[PDB]
């Protein structure tokens, strides 16, 4: 047997290049004149992401990045 | 691999001189790395990483890789974990 090549569909399905939000650590904290630190987003009730890892502010919900826990 | 997995493999080598494998892609975990939770897919290719540099020796027989520590392979693992030159591996010990 010899090979049919067959290299054709709706041409490509290219992958996701990773999102570069520059200095997004500055987004979470907000420091006022005295040093006031109001934490804008949520701390997870889990064990591995408690007191060190923060959560997500989408438009109506919560979505943790480590343990993938979802609220609304 | 994550860096938790990289440094489990290197502990059992410098103690002994030997790391073995099954050549299983479907494997959940390797049995020597017990309660250390490294898939046996990860034991292979880090041990494939040190061949092309010249550190581990392949000599394959019946679906199970064998590996040794090179004389230049001895000094490589002492810089990573910082073991001192006060401690020997199991090579220079017996008799």
């Amino acid at each position: 047997k010899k090979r049919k090549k067959k290299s054709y569909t709706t041409p490509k399905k290219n992958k996701h290049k990773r999102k570069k939000v520059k200095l997004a650590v500055l987004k979470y904290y907000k420091v006022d004149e005295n040093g006031k630190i109001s934490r804008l987003r949520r701390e997870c009730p889990s064990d591995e992401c408690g007191a060190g890892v923060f959560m997500a502010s989408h438009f109506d919900r919560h979505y943790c990045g480590k343990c993938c826990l979802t609220y609304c | 691999m994550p860096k938790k997995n990289r440094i489990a493999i290197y502990e059992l080598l410098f103690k002994e001189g030997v790391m073995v494998a099954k050549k299983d892609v479907h494997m959940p975990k390797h049995p020597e790395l017990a309660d250390k939770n490294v898939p046996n897919l990860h034991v292979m290719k880090a041990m494939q990483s040190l061949k092309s540099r010249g550190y581990v020796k392949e000599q394959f027989a019946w679906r199970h890789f064998y590996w040794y520590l090179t004389n230049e392979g001895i000094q490589y693992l002492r810089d990573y974990l910082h073991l001192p030159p006060e401690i020997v591996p199991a090579t220079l010990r017996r008799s």
Binding site: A24, L26, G35, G52 | L81, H82
Partner: protein, 123 residues
């Protein structure tokens, strides 16, 4: 007090990588020192973002973390250790970090001597 003032920080950072506590960068260095587990911190002086210096030092002294100062972003990453070396030992390539968080010390009477006295008279 044999090690000099900024010189005594060379012995400190070698010992933690025996036990893997130096989390480098901007993002983990805040959070892993929020974690009520680590000892101290340093911020570099060569730093370009105005929103950078605001957030870092405010979390420190509230959670009882004292700050030392070394100048460069090139300097405080060679203690983090990202920089590659040549065949003869030259620091060939530099990618330095402007933040360090130390969690576990080693046991060195050279490192612990000089830097802890710097903090008492500051109080």
């Amino acid at each position: 007090g044999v090690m000099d003032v900024n010189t005594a920080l060379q012995e400190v950072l070698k010992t933690a990588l025996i036990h893997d506590g130096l989390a480098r960068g901007i993002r983990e260095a805040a959070k892993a020192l929020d974690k009520r587990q680590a000892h101290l911190c340093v911020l570099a002086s060569n730093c370009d973002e105005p929103m950078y210096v605001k957030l870092v030092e405010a979390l420190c002294a509230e959670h009882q973390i004292n700050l030392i100062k070394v100048d460069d972003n090139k300097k405080l990453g060679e203690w983090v250790g990202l920089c590659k070396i040549d065949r003869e030992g030259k620091p060939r390539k530099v990618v330095g970090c402007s933040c360090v968080v130390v969690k576990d010390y080693g046991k060195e009477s050279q490192a612990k001597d000089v830097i802890e006295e710097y903090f008492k008279c500051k109080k």
